[PDB]
Amino acid sequence: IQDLIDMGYGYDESDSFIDNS
Amino acid sequence: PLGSPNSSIVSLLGIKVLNNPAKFTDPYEFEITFECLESLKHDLEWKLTYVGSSRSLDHDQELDSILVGPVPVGVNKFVFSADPPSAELIPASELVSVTVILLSCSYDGREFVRVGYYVNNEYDEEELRENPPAKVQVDHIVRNILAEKPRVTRFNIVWD
Amino acid sequence: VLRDNIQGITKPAIRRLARRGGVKRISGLIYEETRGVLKVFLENVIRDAVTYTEHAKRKTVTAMDVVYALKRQGRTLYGFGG
Amino acid sequence: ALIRKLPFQRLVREIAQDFKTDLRFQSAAIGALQEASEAYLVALFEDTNLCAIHAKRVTIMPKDIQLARRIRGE
Ligand SMILES: [Cl-]
Ligand SMILES: [Cl-]
Ligand SMILES: [Cl-]
Ligand SMILES: [Cl-]
Ligand SMILES: [Cl-]
Ligand SMILES: [Cl-]
Ligand SMILES: [Cl-]
Ligand SMILES: [Cl-]
């Protein structure tokens, strides 16, 4: 469950490829 | 009722390789024990595939296939005596080497389980092992199936 | 745009993963081989992932889209009846 | 993670856009893919190791990797 919480962390969200809306 | 990854009516309980090790040209004697939960309309289709080359699927050999049915509910056992591969269809550089055999079962053309084994091929004489002949001497090749370490891959299919 | 990002997967990363799998020594040939396999896996899963995404009339692949795609590779266990 | 996330992100972006350029990912989606990719490669190397061992060899070869793919029912 802890891995699920941290799963999205650590990537370059500046990338237009990433949409976290 | 309960959410489950596996919904298969049929599941394997064990497989014994009766003749191991064996000559390259010996048939494969698989004693297959499985469980069937419900009655099924169609038969089970077992296939044995030999990987002739690790570099591509172009040299795969379907060794044998058997239809088993009608399948009764409960624990079942049968012996699948599958034909050996053809040496001449295997690249000579890859014949006396380790490879893979795939024992799969499908229902109405839908594969639900695939059992992989490693198989090593080796000459039965020390001299031949140290110095492989230019032409492969098939009658001196012994195969060894790693029957204690099968890789069992289950798939989810629609049954009846 | 940049290409050949499969080369971004480094040699020590590949050795790292191999060691975790119990493999201590790998030759130079293993690197490109592993990269090839990794690309194929990623391609296959992303294909299946998008299928779940487009079916939901969306353009952004979500984590659950990936999970559903992963549930199709089939479960590989060691031994029978596990 | 055993792989740096930024190089993995670039790889995912490339493959995804080569499929359909009109496509975006959540960060947790990339994370899900990376965890699965790393787990898949580790398991692969385990069977790669087992292959070489049954071959009575001590060093893995490209063929061991390819055979490991076949044996895992890909
Ligand atoms: Cl099973
Ligand atoms: Cl070998
Ligand atoms: Cl030999
Ligand atoms: Cl064994
Ligand atoms: Cl290095
Ligand atoms: Cl990182
Ligand atoms: Cl890295
Ligand atoms: Cl090789």
Residue numbers in the entry:
A (entry chain D): 122 to 142
B (entry chain A): -5 to 154
C (entry chain C): 21 to 102
D (entry chain B): 60 to 133
Quoted from the paper:
In metazoan cells, there are two major H3 variants: H3.1 is deposited by the trimeric CAF-1 complex during DNA replication and repair of ultraviolet-induced DNA damage, while histone H3.3 is deposited in a replication-independent manner by either DAXX/ATRX largely at heterochromatin, including pericentromeres, telomeres and endogenous retroviral elements, or by the HIRA complex predominantly at gene regulatory regions, gene bodies, developmentally regulated genes, and sites of DNA and chromatin damage and repair. While the H3/H4 histone chaperone ASF1a interacts with both CAF-1 and HIRA complexes and binds to both H3.3/H4 and H3.1/H4 for histone deposition, CABIN1 and ubinuclein-1 (UBN1) are unique members of the HIRA complex. The molecular basis for how the HIRA complex selectively binds to H3.3, which differs from H3.1 by only 5 amino acids, is unknown. In this study, we report that H3.3-specific binding by the HIRA complex is mediated by the UBN1-HRD.
From those crystals, we determined the 2.3 Å X-ray crystal structure of a complex containing human UBN1(122–142) bound to Xenopus laevis H3.3(60–133), X. laevis H4(21–102) and S. cerevisiae Asf1(1–154). Not surprisingly, the Asf1/H3.3/H4 component of the structure superimposes perfectly with the previously reported Asf1/H3.1/H4 structure (root mean squared deviation=0.821 Å for all identical atoms) since the differences between H3.3 and H3.1 do not reside at the Asf1–histone interface. UBN1 residues 122–127 form a short helix and residues 128–142 a coil, with the coil wrapping over a surface of H3.3 formed by helices 1 and 2 and the intervening turn. The UBN1–H3.3 interface is nucleated by UBN1 residues F138 and Y132 that protrude into largely hydrophobic pockets on H3.3 and position the coil of residues 128–132 in a saddle that sits over the top of H3.3 G90. The hydroxyl group of UBN1 Y132 forms a hydrogen bond with the side chain of H3.3 Q93. UBN1 F138 sits in a hydrophobic pocket where it forms an extensive network of van der Waals interactions with the aliphatic chain of H3.3 R72 and the aromatic ring of H3.3 F84, as well as supporting interactions with H3.3 V71, A77 and I89. UBN1 D136 and D140 form hydrogen bonds with H3.3 R72 and H4 T80, respectively, while the UBN1 N141 side chain makes hydrogen-bonding interactions with both the backbone amide and the side chain hydroxyl of H3.3 S86. UBN1 residues M128-Y132 sit in close proximity above H3.3 G90. A modelling of H3.3 G90M bound to UBN1 predicts that UBN1 would directly clash with a methionine at this position, suggesting that UBN1 employs a mechanism of steric occlusion to prevent unfavourable binding with H3.1. A comparison of the structure reported here with the DAXX/H3.3/H4 complex reveals that while the histone chaperones UBN1 and DAXX share no sequence conservation, they bind the region of H3.3/H4 surrounding G90 with striking similarity.
